[PDB]
Design an enzyme around this catalytic site. Structure first.
Site, PDB file in Angstrom:
ATOM      1  N   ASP A   1       0.782  -1.234   0.000  1.00  0.00           N
ATOM      2  CA  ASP A   1       0.000   0.000   0.000  1.00  0.00           C
ATOM      3  C   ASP A   1       0.831   1.311   0.000  1.00  0.00           C
ATOM      4  OD1 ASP A   1      -2.108   1.824   0.469  1.00  0.00           O
ATOM      5  OD2 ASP A   1      -2.985   0.539   2.030  1.00  0.00           O
ATOM      6  N   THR A   2       0.928   1.992  -1.149  1.00  0.00           N
ATOM      7  CA  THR A   2       1.709   3.245  -1.256  1.00  0.00           C
ATOM      8  C   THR A   2       1.109   4.427  -0.478  1.00  0.00           C
ATOM      9  OG1 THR A   2       0.549   3.885  -3.290  1.00  0.00           O
ATOM     10  CG2 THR A   2       2.606   2.661  -3.542  1.00  0.00           C
ATOM     11  N   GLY A   3      -0.093   4.253   0.049  1.00  0.00           N
ATOM     12  CA  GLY A   3      -0.705   5.325   0.803  1.00  0.00           C
ATOM     13  C   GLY A   3      -0.509   5.133   2.291  1.00  0.00           C
TER      14      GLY A   3
END
Ligand SMILES: CC[C@@H](c1ccccc1)c1c(O)c2c(oc1=O)CCCCCC2
Lengths: 99, 99
Positions: A25-27
């Site tokens: 998850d890049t967030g």
């Protein structure tokens, strides 16, 4: 490797030997996995996101084998709906979000 | 373009003309933003974040401009603390995750 986004970026990770399914998850600013025991030397944290907060126990310098590479990083354990690997691990892995 | 993830992949996207700031999320299946008011067909919906549920309104066929590419998509609006673009829009753009 190259991950297409047509499928959820879910991989198998080996934290201190224990096998977990994690979503890349890049967030996620951090990393939070549930159902893993990592010792009696932790730090109580609190992380927020959509819908609310979650209490977590932080453990630094933890062996992590994922994507045929071993990194030593910080992970938080706690009651999370799906195990997440946030940017703190993705940077340590040398991953990028490309267009 | 290429995002290094050391500093949070945030961009400006226009939703039927209105500019917003959104985080590129590889773990979310859908997309949700705060404040936009549209008129497309909508359906009431509730989503679960990493900490609780939030009440949203869902729109279909919404014109979205991000990174100089136009798309027709499904997005949600509600009182979210962070605006995110999920895999439904990410895939339409052709973005990927590499190592
Ligand atoms: C943008 C905030 C983010 C986050 C992750 C971990 C800790 C704090 C905040 C976050 C997601 O990446 C996802 C979801 O809700 C979120 O709040 C939806 C539920 C499914 C999990 C993956 C997407």
């Amino acid at each position: 490797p190259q991950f297409s986004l047509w499928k959820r970026p879910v991989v198998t990770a080996y934290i201190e030997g224990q096998p977990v399914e994690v979503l890349l998850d890049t967030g996620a600013d951090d990393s939070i996995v549930a159902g893993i025991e990592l010792g009696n030397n932790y730090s109580p944290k609190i992380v927020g996101g959509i819908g609310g907060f979650i209490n977590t126990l932080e453990y630094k310098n933890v062996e992590i084998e994922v994507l045929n590479k071993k990194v030593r990083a910080t992970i938080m354990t706690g009651d999370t709906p799906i195990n997440i690997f946030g940017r703190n691990i993705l940077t340590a892995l040398g991953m990028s979000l490309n267009l």
